[PDB]
Amino acid sequence: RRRIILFPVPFQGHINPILQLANVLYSKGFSITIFHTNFNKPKTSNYPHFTFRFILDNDPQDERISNLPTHGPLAGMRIPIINEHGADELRRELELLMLASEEDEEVSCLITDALWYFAQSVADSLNLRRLVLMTSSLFNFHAHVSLPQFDELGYLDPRLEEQASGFPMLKVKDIKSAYSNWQILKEILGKMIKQTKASSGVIWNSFKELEESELETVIREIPAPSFLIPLPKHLTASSSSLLDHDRTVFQWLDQQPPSSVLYVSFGSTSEVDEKDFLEIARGLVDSKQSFLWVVRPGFVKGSTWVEPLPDGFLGERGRIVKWVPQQEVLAHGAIGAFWTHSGWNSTLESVCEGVPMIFSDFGLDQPLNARYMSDVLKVGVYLENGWERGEIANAIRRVMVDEEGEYIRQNARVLKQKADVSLMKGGSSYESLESLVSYISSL
Ligand SMILES: O=c1ccn([C@@H]2O[C@H](COP(=O)(O)OP(=O)(O)O)[C@@H](O)[C@H]2O)c(=O)[nH]1
């Protein structure tokens, strides 16, 4: 019997793929331990088949992380802090577990979020192999390793509509938005890349037919073996939700005609002005399409939830809720399109359920996902110039109703089929997973 320890980053878009992976590996016969912070912990009672061990922010909490905000853009400060100071505790916890191991039980490897770059030297020091889970795309990684070239050209220092030097796929505007903050994130980025290259293997939440153009860069830049597995095609992330689901939406979805509903959601951490929030609502109403709009409490700066919205303003066609089982909604027959912030989990979920998209973005990898999805794969329309009700209504109707958008709807259907075929024997994802299991078993 072989045990795998997995160590996620404690945010929704990082906990979801690592617990999907944990379940996949469990299905292949591995026992599973999850190392996790108390902060943003998932519901351990949803995982009776996993062992959870809480680390790094136990009582008494550190002056470095104590009273750090549990929500907002500053909650992420925990990441660099744990990278800089958690090595000794992580080693102690790994040793404790390796000591408590049953005689017939071996710890095969540690799998961490790529953001936990500090974990490589910890694993090395224990003669424990470390594999890395990337929670972003191969295309985004290709952009990462092109930063030096981008910097030479001055893209990173603030011709926007112009094609980038080595990315005809990208506009200079995309790169500026993606690396808008860079003196701040440059240091994290370099260390993550360096310790990913130094790892024993890299697992990508993707599939070959999704990012074929990006495979050679990964093979050339990362000496460790890479494995591409589209985790949403194996299972949804419902069990790792950090918020309660509103499942009353499914009775409502059951009252809608096929492909008639726009699903709208901007992920787990995004926030918008009161002004932009109201413009989005007017664009949705103006589209005349039915819509289901997830507005996470905290999404609107200065309001607990959705106070600025007039009572009944959404009217007949629209519903607003706080949180749903997103991939399950995307799989419902009523959904015709997905207005996304282009987070990678949401984008891959939509691809895997065959739902075409309208893209907004909040920086980081999101503009790159939106550009790649909209111009390379051609499964959506990118609202790349802010929020204006007219352009919003036109984009929604183009994807969902216009005859001119049929090719986008068809591309989304075909791309889902490619994902499905990739999981069949002889498919790319099937062979990646087979290779991953045999590789881990050889450690
Ligand atoms: O109402 C919601 C909204 C989002 N999600 C999930 O939250 C994750 C968001 O991750 P993503 O990479 O899309 O964006 P992030 O939150 O990291 O910005 C995805 O797995 C979604 O399915 C969900 O379960 N219910």
Contact between 120 and 199 (Cβ < 8 Å): yes
Q: Is residue 62 part of a domain?
A: yes
For residue 359, what are the β-bridge partners? 340, 382
Same domain? 276 vs 194: no
Q: Are strands 31-36 and 51-54 parallel, antiparallel or unpaired?
A: parallel
Q: Is residue 329 part of a domain?
A: yes
Same domain? 241 vs 251: no
Q: Is residue 159 part of a domain?
A: no
- Cα 411 from Cα 389, distance rounded (Å): 26
- Cα 361 from Cα 384, distance rounded (Å): 8
Same domain? 241 vs 385: no
b/e per residue, 273-298, with b = 16+ CB within 10 A? eeeebbbbbbbbbebebbbbbbbbeb
Same domain? 328 vs 242: no
Whether ligand 1 lies within 6 angstroms of the CB of 237 is answered as: yes
Token pair listed for 130: 């470390």
Same domain? 12 vs 22: yes
| Residue 339: HSE in the Cβ half-sphere, 13 Å Cα cutoff | 29
Same domain? 290 vs 264: yes
Contact between 81 and 65 (Cβ < 8 Å): yes
b/e per residue, 45-71, with b = 16+ CB within 10 A? eebeebeeeebbbeeeeeeebeebeee
Token pair listed for 436: 């991953």
Q: How far apart are the first and last CA of the chain?
A: 13
Output the residue whose Cα is nearest ligand 1's atom 23. 326
**Candidates 271, 291, 326, 366: which one to mutate for ligand 1, based on the most atoms within 8 Å of Cβ?**
326
Q: Is residue 174 part of a domain?
A: no
Cα separations (Å) of 419 from 142, 202, 293, 349? 22, 20, 27, 11
Name the active-site residue from 57, 113, 174, 361: 113
Token pair listed for 137: 């795309």
Three-state SS across the chain? CEEEEEECCCCHHHHHHHHHHHHHHHHCCCEEEEEECCCCCCCHHHCCCCEEEECCCCCCCCCCCCCCCCCCCCHHHHHHHHHHHCHHHHHHHHHHHHHHCCCCCEEEEEEEECCCCCHHHHHHHCCCCEEEEECCCHHHHHHHHCHHHHHHCCCCCCCCCCECCCCCCCEHHHHHHHCCCCCCCHHHHHHHHHHHHCCCCEEECCCCCCCHHHHHHHHHHCCCCEEECCHHHHCCCHHHCCCCCCCHHHHHHCCCCCCCEEEEECCCCCCECHHHHHHHHHHHHHHCCEEEEECCCCCECCCCCCCCCCCCCCCCCEEEECCCCHHHHHCCCCEEEEEECCCHHHHHHHHHCCCCEEECCCCCCHHHHHHHHHHHHCCEEECCCCCCHHHHHHHHHHHHCCHHHHHHHHHHHHHHHHHHHHCCCCCHHHHHHHHHHHHHHHC
Cα separations (Å) of 26 from 5, 62, 149, 325, 331? 11, 34, 42, 22, 24
For residue 171, what are the β-bridge partners? 163
- Type of residue numbered 122: V
Q: Is residue 194 part of a domain?
A: yes
Query: Given strand 335-340, what is the order of strands in its sheet?
Result: 318-321, 290-294, 261-265, 335-340, 357-359, 380-382
Other beta carbons less than 10 A from residue 365's beta carbon: 22
- Cα 308 from Cα 324, distance rounded (Å): 22
Angle, helices 186-197 vs 138-145, to 10°: value is 110
Domain count, the chain: 2
- In which domain, by residue range, is 119 found? 1-153+183-246+423-443
Q: Indicate if 113 belongs to the active site.
A: yes
Contact between 249 and 329 (Cβ < 8 Å): yes
- Cα 401 from Cα 137, distance rounded (Å): 30
Q: Which residues contact 425 (CB under 8 A, 6 or more apart)?
A: none
Other beta carbons less than 10 A from residue 234's beta carbon: 16
Contact between 130 and 199 (Cβ < 8 Å): yes
Between vectors from CA 143 to CA 343 and to CA 175, what angle results, nearest 5°? 75
Name the active-site residue from 14, 36, 142, 332: 14
Contact between 440 and 109 (Cβ < 8 Å): yes
Q: Indicate if 14 belongs to the active site.
A: yes
- Cα 357 from Cα 409, distance rounded (Å): 9
- Type of residue numbered 424: M
Same domain? 26 vs 105: yes
Same domain? 380 vs 435: no
Q: Report whether the peptide linkage leading into residue 168 is cis, meaning its omega lies within 30 degrees of zero.
A: no
| Backbone dihedral region for residue 327 (phi beyond 0: left; psi -120 to 50: alpha; all else: beta) | alpha
Whether ligand 1 lies within 6 angstroms of the CB of 299 is answered as: no
Measure 297 CA to ligand 1 centroid, in angstroms.
14
Q: Is residue 169 part of a domain?
A: no
CATH number, position 399: 3.40.50.2000
Other beta carbons less than 10 A from residue 442's beta carbon: 8
- Type of residue numbered 291: F
- Cα 434 from Cα 126, distance rounded (Å): 27
Contact between 208 and 428 (Cβ < 8 Å): yes
Whether ligand 1 lies within 6 angstroms of the CB of 345 is answered as: yes
- Cα 364 from Cα 249, distance rounded (Å): 31
Report CA dihedral (52, 53, 57, 61) to the nearest 10 degrees: 120
Nearest Cα neighbor of 136 from 404, 306, 347, 374 is 347
Whether ligand 1 lies within 6 angstroms of the CB of 135 is answered as: no
* CA atoms 158, 163, 164, 170: torsion sign: positive
Same domain? 310 vs 340: yes
Please name the method used to determine this structure: X-ray
Nearest Cα neighbor of 319 from 333, 335, 331, 303 is 335
316, with CB counted inside 10 A (0-12, 13-18, 19+), is exposed
359, with CB counted inside 10 A (0-12, 13-18, 19+), is buried
Q: Which residues contact 197 (CB under 8 A, 6 or more apart)?
A: 221, 222, 223, 224
Resolution (A): 1.8
Token pair listed for 260: 């008639």
Backbone φ, ψ for residue 187 (5° rounding): -70, -45
Q: Is residue 163 part of a domain?
A: no
Same domain? 227 vs 271: no
Same domain? 208 vs 272: no
Measure 237 CA to ligand 1 centroid, in angstroms.
9
| Residue 180: HSE in the Cβ half-sphere, 13 Å Cα cutoff | 12
Same domain? 276 vs 330: yes
Q: Is residue 161 part of a domain?
A: no
